[PDB]
Design a protein around this ligand. Structure first.
Ligand code: NA
Length: 220
């Protein structure tokens, strides 16, 4: 529709529950006349007072989403939409669109002791080579070398050809679990990709690196 947005995605920095922080979206009224804009839904972890405004023309206004983590929200990657409802007083009415807002929410580590935290060891680079038309599986061993249980709060992929699921989400000291990875070359083809280079993102209770990324490569 008429409204144009600075970003399809907004991403808070890695944050602890008490962190403050702000993400900025610039919306712009493209077509001709008045746009009436309502922010009809906000992520549960953000604040916005600029919620119901009028817009004249061009690329005029700014929205500043303040971080407000709900008390007792657990750590992990949060992905929630900012929902924008646009009504053109004259030329019709409605278009609805959303911007995905992401938060890498981690543990409050200064409040945790060594007996409560893990240390993650794994391969962070996986080149799967040439796949030639079949869904291809791999497994990365995730190891806990810490003194406490290693907890995998979230394991997320953004690429639609890539999935990753750990066998367990809590790993005792000296123990390990498999991260089962699958790449779908048919999805890559349907998307006109000859190759991918995509991250698996892991949020965990490793105090030295609570957000860990595995780069996965694959070609058709
Ligand atoms: Na995916």
């Amino acid at each position: 529709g008429p409204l144009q947005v600075s970003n399809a995605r907004l991403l808070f920095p890695i944050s602890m529950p008490e962190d403050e922080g702000v993400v900025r979206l610039v919306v712009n009224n493209t077509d001709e006349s008045d746009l009436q804009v309502a922010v009809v839904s906000l992520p549960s972890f953000v604040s916005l007072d600029d919620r119901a405004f009028r817009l004249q023309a061009r690329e005029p206004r700014e929205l500043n989403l303040s971080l407000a983590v709900p008390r007792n929200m657990p750590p992990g990657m949060k992905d929630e939409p900012l929902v924008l409802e646009v009504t053109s007083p004259e030329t019709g009415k409605k278009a609805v669109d959303s911007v995905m807002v992401s938060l890498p929410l981690v543990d409050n580590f200064p409040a945790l002791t060594a007996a409560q935290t893990g240390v993650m060891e794994l391969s962070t680079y996986l080149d799967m080579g040439q796949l030639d038309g079949e869904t291809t599986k791999a497994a990365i061993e995730i190891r806990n070398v810490g003194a406490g249980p290693l907890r995998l709060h979230s394991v997320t992929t953004r690429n639609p050809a890539l999935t990753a699921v750990p066998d367990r989400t809590e790993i005792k000291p000296g123990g390990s679990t498999l991260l089962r990875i699958a790449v779908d070359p048919q999805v890559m083809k349907a998307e006109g990709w000859q190759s991918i280079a995509a991250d698996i993102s892991i949020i965990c209770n490793d105090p030295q690196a609570p957000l860990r990324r595995i780069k996965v490569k694959a070609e058709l």
